[PDB]
Design an enzyme around this catalytic site. Structure first.
Site, PDB file in Angstrom:
ATOM      1  N   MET A 276       0.797  -1.226   0.000  1.00  0.00           N
ATOM      2  CA  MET A 276       0.000   0.000   0.000  1.00  0.00           C
ATOM      3  C   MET A 276       0.834   1.283   0.000  1.00  0.00           C
ATOM      4  O   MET A 276       0.637   2.167  -0.829  1.00  0.00           O
ATOM      5  CB  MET A 276      -0.938   0.026   1.208  1.00  0.00           C
ATOM      6  CG  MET A 276      -2.407  -0.134   0.857  1.00  0.00           C
ATOM      7  SD  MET A 276      -2.973   1.086  -0.353  1.00  0.00           S
ATOM      8  CE  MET A 276      -2.831   0.098  -1.884  1.00  0.00           C
ATOM      9  N   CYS A 277       1.761   1.382   0.936  1.00  0.00           N
ATOM     10  CA  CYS A 277       2.595   2.557   1.044  1.00  0.00           C
ATOM     11  C   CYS A 277       3.186   2.948  -0.301  1.00  0.00           C
ATOM     12  O   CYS A 277       3.113   4.108  -0.704  1.00  0.00           O
ATOM     13  CB  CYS A 277       3.704   2.313   2.053  1.00  0.00           C
ATOM     14  N   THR A 278       3.764   1.977  -0.998  1.00  0.00           N
ATOM     15  CA  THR A 278       4.383   2.247  -2.286  1.00  0.00           C
ATOM     16  C   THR A 278       3.345   2.727  -3.285  1.00  0.00           C
ATOM     17  O   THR A 278       3.491   3.795  -3.865  1.00  0.00           O
ATOM     18  CB  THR A 278       5.110   0.985  -2.840  1.00  0.00           C
ATOM     19  OG1 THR A 278       6.207   0.652  -1.976  1.00  0.00           O
ATOM     20  CG2 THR A 278       5.645   1.226  -4.248  1.00  0.00           C
TER      21      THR A 278
ATOM     22  N   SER B 225       1.847   6.151  -1.993  1.00  0.00           N
ATOM     23  CA  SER B 225       2.666   7.318  -1.683  1.00  0.00           C
ATOM     24  C   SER B 225       4.108   7.339  -2.172  1.00  0.00           C
ATOM     25  O   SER B 225       4.775   8.357  -2.042  1.00  0.00           O
ATOM     26  CB  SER B 225       2.657   7.569  -0.165  1.00  0.00           C
ATOM     27  OG  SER B 225       3.646   6.792   0.492  1.00  0.00           O
TER      28      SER B 225
END
Ligand SMILES: [Zn+2]
Lengths: 414, 522, 13
Positions: free
Chosen positions: A207-209, A212
């Site tokens: 998710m982070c990648t 964001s």
């Protein structure tokens, strides 16, 4: 004219009517084994895509006649470079149906019965009917599910496995110029669950990648597909993204380039956009032919006991020259799927996480139920909510019972 | 329907276009493949070539369809019995793909060799199947002298045999599996030191930078550049882990920890590349020097000059969790350098075309870009001739003898094939075809084996079980074994046509019995 | 494999 013309099975008979130095111990020459193949041996082919077409041809020309095929898909234009049982006219029709149609027409007295279904639609009763099952599917979930189903058919009398209840499972997979084949004898050798390392689940970006720190064109495409389309609803409220819809991909492609510009990422192309959305795996006819051949040859061996079967796991690689590699996967004694003894956890979202984030049990969405009362579930939005209270009603020896989309079985863990 | 066929193909061949690209598809669609003897092995191979869209094909077969022919071939039928096999096979194979043009010749290869030897000059590649020894050697000679790629494939019982013959097959796009990254941490370029120096967010930095950070530190103490995996590499791992402090940084630094075993990796010219450089064709140019070697040479020049001992920087790097801006700037440093070295390589290519007057730009800019990307992956395959393998003094008896150290090495299968062929010469038929001739054929087969071996002074021990087993085969062509060989063989042909990936060098023997195989350089 | 396996060439029950 009779069904079989002169010399029709000449290329098969020789391995059934002649004694030999490398034969299987329990093998005896006979002018009656071919008959069992033509008249009674029931073989189920799971999948009408890729390996499936190749598998139906192989079994048909090897003397099998009672063959069944299961497939929930429709013929797609992209199937046509390798799924030779389908033609452009067939685009849109069920593969299962077309595969049987083509096969029954090309091989004179073959009897391929199709099933426009997914493997989950059936129960024990349906699968026990078969002597051998060959799976040429592409999702790990299906492989595991059918693996669990056959394990469930096993019948132990006092801890003494009933051989008649064993249904061999031949499994094959392909990926570009790589492929794998393996023989599984439920309750005797390593099952799919015994070697989870061999089935590394596909890529699923963090998710982070995605949300964001995009760095690659794929992350952009992925962001649009996984977040922007659900948020915005380009084609109307409730309208789900259809990976095959030309208009949908053009939309995804445009928003992808948009996000790529903002982060100075190169490479967003329509082709790459299709690849990601559909999670496409490159494929060709040759690799499928090689692997389906290994698999069929093994189905034949298991049926006639002509030779001892592939120990158990063969790999094929066609990239730098070519080679085959075979090794014996070990039946894990602590196996959640084929062991006979219940699991031993030693400890709510402590187990749901353990049953999910572990490696020995890569369960996807387990529903945990205490001895006689649903503790947690997920299949019900109230169950995932009402029962959700994960928030820290049990004792010591209590026999928990998990359930995932990964198996037809209820894995008993204590 | 012109453009509705352009996109019709794009969607049809999508799954494969993702493997060899539009260029690969092009090479494939321009090729004309020839197949000799449409039995199971040949139609299987052919189908695997027709489905992906081979430009065209021509089947050469002078036989009639037999009963067992229609019994083991997906591209023949009961109604085909008695008719010409080449003709009957094409009709069915042709149905598989209308973008391919089928064709045949109702003659035998022997016949076409006597009257029209040049006939085979029209094909990109020739695939021969189920051919007798004499026809093969004779076919090899012509094709070898004609520079025509040849693949001999044979299915005998549970044995698959494949033999490729190409004088020289140079490949640039070999598609290496799991290759070491060209990170240059050991031999940084100015721009790379600059980019690293620019450091000193912290939880979102490319691991490559976290490593370089400690690499400059480590290298400043012991001054050792670290080949000891566990040893200078495990302490290095520990040193890196130390710098976290209260950081819920692990994910960042930890990923730096993982790649430490794959990135301290040296920079260095691959052995395979040295040999390409130090090869007679790379050193001595002429007007005939093919584009490949010119590019090979230019690369050698680069390593001498601008390269300072090494190959042009690749340009690519693996993904690395890190802020988008940091990741991109880092990547660009490598792309810039890659573009920079490429140009240099281009400058050398020009200076080689001039001192040869071959042409101004007989090498597209795209080829140059391809060459530099794959400079570390170039490969070259030179196959011996069938004559060399058959000659009494040229035969690689060491390979055979050594392999026979293991009585079950799949080289016994090749020895038995040779004996079966000799048996076919002496007896005019294959051994054990009749359930009645088996017991008696064992001895005659052992006889022809002994003769073949003594003829080559091959002091090897072939177990009797194999002679018995080869007789038991009755020269069968089991479909599933032909299917295996057919997929394998098919892809090798695609490798020939496209010059992508790497072809197996010399003989491949497959045993359907033990589901094992091996490659030999006979 | 500890024990060898052989498929019964008869119909199932
Ligand atoms: Zn298991």
């Amino acid at each position: 004219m009779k069904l079989d013309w002169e010399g029709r099975w000449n290329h098969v008979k020789k391995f059934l009517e002649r004694s030999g130095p490398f034969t299987h111990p329990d093998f005896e020459p006979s002018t009656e084994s071919l008959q069992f193949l033509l008249d009674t041996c029931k073989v189920l082919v799971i999948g009408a895509g890729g390996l499936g077409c190749e598998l139906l041809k192989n079994l048909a020309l090897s003397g099998f006649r009672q063959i069944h095929v299961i497939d929930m898909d429709t013929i797609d234009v992209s199937n046509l470079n390798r799924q030779f049982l389908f033609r452009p006219k067939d685009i849109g029709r069920p593969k299962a149906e077309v595969a049987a149609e083509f096969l029954n027409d090309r091989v004179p007295n073959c009897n391929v019965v199709p099933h426009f279904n997914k493997i989950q639609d059936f129960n024990d009763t349906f699968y026990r009917q078969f002597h051998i099952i060959v799976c040429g599917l592409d999702s790990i979930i299906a492989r595991r599910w059918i693996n669990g189903m056959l394990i469930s058919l096993l019948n132990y009398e006092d801890g003494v496995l009933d051989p008649s209840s064993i249904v061999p499972l031949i499994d094959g997979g392909t990926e570009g110029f790589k492929g794998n084949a393996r023989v599984i004898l439920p309750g005797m050798t390593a099952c799919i669950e015994c070697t989870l390392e061999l089935y590394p689940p596909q890529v699923n970006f963090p998710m982070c990648t995605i949300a964001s720190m995009p760095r690659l064109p794929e992350h952009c495409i992925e962001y649009v597909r996984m977040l922007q389309w659900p948020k915005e609803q380009p084609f109307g409220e409730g309208v789900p993204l259809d990976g095959d819809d030309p208009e949908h991909i053009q939309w995804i492609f445009q928003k992808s380039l948009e996000r790529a510009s903002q982060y100075n990422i190169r490479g967003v192309t329509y082709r790459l956009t299709q690849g990601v959305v559909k999670r496409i795996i490159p494929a060709v006819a040759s690799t499928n032919a090689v692997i389906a051949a290994v698999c069929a040859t093994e189905v034949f061996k298991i049926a006639t006991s002509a030779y001892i079967p592939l120990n158990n796991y063969l790999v094929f690689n066609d990239v730098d020259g070519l080679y085959t590699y075979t090794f014996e996967a070990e039946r894990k004694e602590n196996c959640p799927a084929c062991s006979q003894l219940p699991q031993n956890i030693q400890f709510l979202q402590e187990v749901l996480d353990y049953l999910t984030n572990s490696a020995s049990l890569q369960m996807k969405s387990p529903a945990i139920t205490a001895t006689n009362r649903t503790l947690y579930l997920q299949s019900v939005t109230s169950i995932e909510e009402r029962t959700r209270p994960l928030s820290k009603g049990l004792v010591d020896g209590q026999e928990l019972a998990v359930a995932d989309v990964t198996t037809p079985q209820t894995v008993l863990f204590k | 329907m012109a453009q509705l066929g352009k996109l019709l193909k794009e969607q049809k061949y999508d799954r494969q276009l993702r493997l060899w690209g539009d260029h690969g598809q092009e090479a494939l669609e321009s090729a004309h493949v020839c197949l000799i003897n449409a039995t199971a092995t040949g139609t299987e191979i052919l189908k695997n070539l027709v489905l992906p869209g081979i430009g065209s094909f021509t089947i050469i077969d002078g036989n009639q369809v037999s009963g067992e022919d229609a019994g083991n071939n997906f591209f023949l039928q009961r109604s085909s019995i008695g008719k010409n096999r080449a003709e009957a096979a094409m009709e069915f194979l042709q149905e598989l793909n209308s973008d391919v043009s089928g064709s045949f010749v109702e003659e035998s290869p022997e016949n076409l060799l006597d009257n029209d030897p040049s006939f085979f000059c029209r094909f990109t590649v020739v695939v021969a199947t189920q051919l007798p020894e004499s026809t093969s050697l004779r076919l090899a000679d012509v094709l070898w002298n004609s520079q025509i790629p040849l693949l001999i494939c044979r299915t005998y019982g549970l044995v698959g045999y494949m033999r490729i013959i190409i004088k020289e097959h140079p490949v640039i796009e070999s598609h290496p599996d799991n290759a070491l990254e060209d990170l240059r941490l050991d031999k940084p370029f100015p721009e790379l030191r600059e980019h690293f120096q620019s450091y000193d967010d912290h939880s979102h930095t490319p691991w490559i930078v976290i490593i370089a950070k400690y690499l400059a530190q480590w290298y400043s103490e012991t001054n050792g550049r670290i080949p000891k995996t566990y040893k200078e590499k495990e302490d290095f791992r520990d040193l890196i882990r130390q710098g976290i402090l209260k950081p819920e940084d692990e994910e960042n630094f930890e990923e730096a920890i993982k790649n430490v075993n794959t990135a301290l990796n040296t920079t260095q010219i691959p052995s395979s590349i040295e040999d390409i450089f130090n090869d007679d064709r790379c050193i001595n140019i002429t007007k005939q020097t093919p584009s490949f070697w010119i590019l090979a040479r230019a690369l050698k020049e680069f390593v001498a000059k601008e390269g300072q001992g090494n190959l042009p920087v690749r340009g690519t790097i693996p993904d690395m969790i890190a802020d988008s801006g940091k990741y991109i700037k880092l990547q660009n440093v490598y792309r810039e350098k890659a573009k920079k070295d490429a140009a240099a390589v281009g400058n050398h290519v020009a200076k080689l075309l001039q001192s040869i007057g071959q042409a101004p730009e007989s090498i597209s800019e795209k080829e140059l870009k391809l060459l530099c990307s794959n400079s570390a992956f170039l490969r070259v395959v030179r196959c011996r001739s069938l004559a060399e393998e058959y000659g009494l003094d040229t035969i690689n008896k060491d390979e055979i003898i050594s392999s026979m150290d293991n009585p079950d090495n799949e080289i016994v299968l090749y020895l038995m094939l040779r004996a079966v062929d000799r048996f076919h010469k002496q007896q005019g038929r294959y051994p054990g075809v009749s359930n009645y001739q088996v017991e008696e054929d064992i001895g005659k087969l052992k006889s022809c084996l002994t003769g073949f071996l003594q003829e080559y002074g091959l002091s090897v021990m072939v177990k009797d079980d194999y002679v018995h087993e080869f007789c038991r085969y009755g020269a069968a062509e089991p479909h599933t074994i032909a299917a295996f060989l057919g997929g394998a063989a098919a892809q090798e042909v695609i490798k020939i046509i496209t010059k992508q990936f790497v072809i197996f060098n010399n003989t491949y023997i497959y045993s359907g019995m033990s589901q094992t195989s091996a490659t030999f350089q006979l | 494999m500890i024990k060898l396996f052989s498929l019964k060439q008869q119909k199932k029950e």
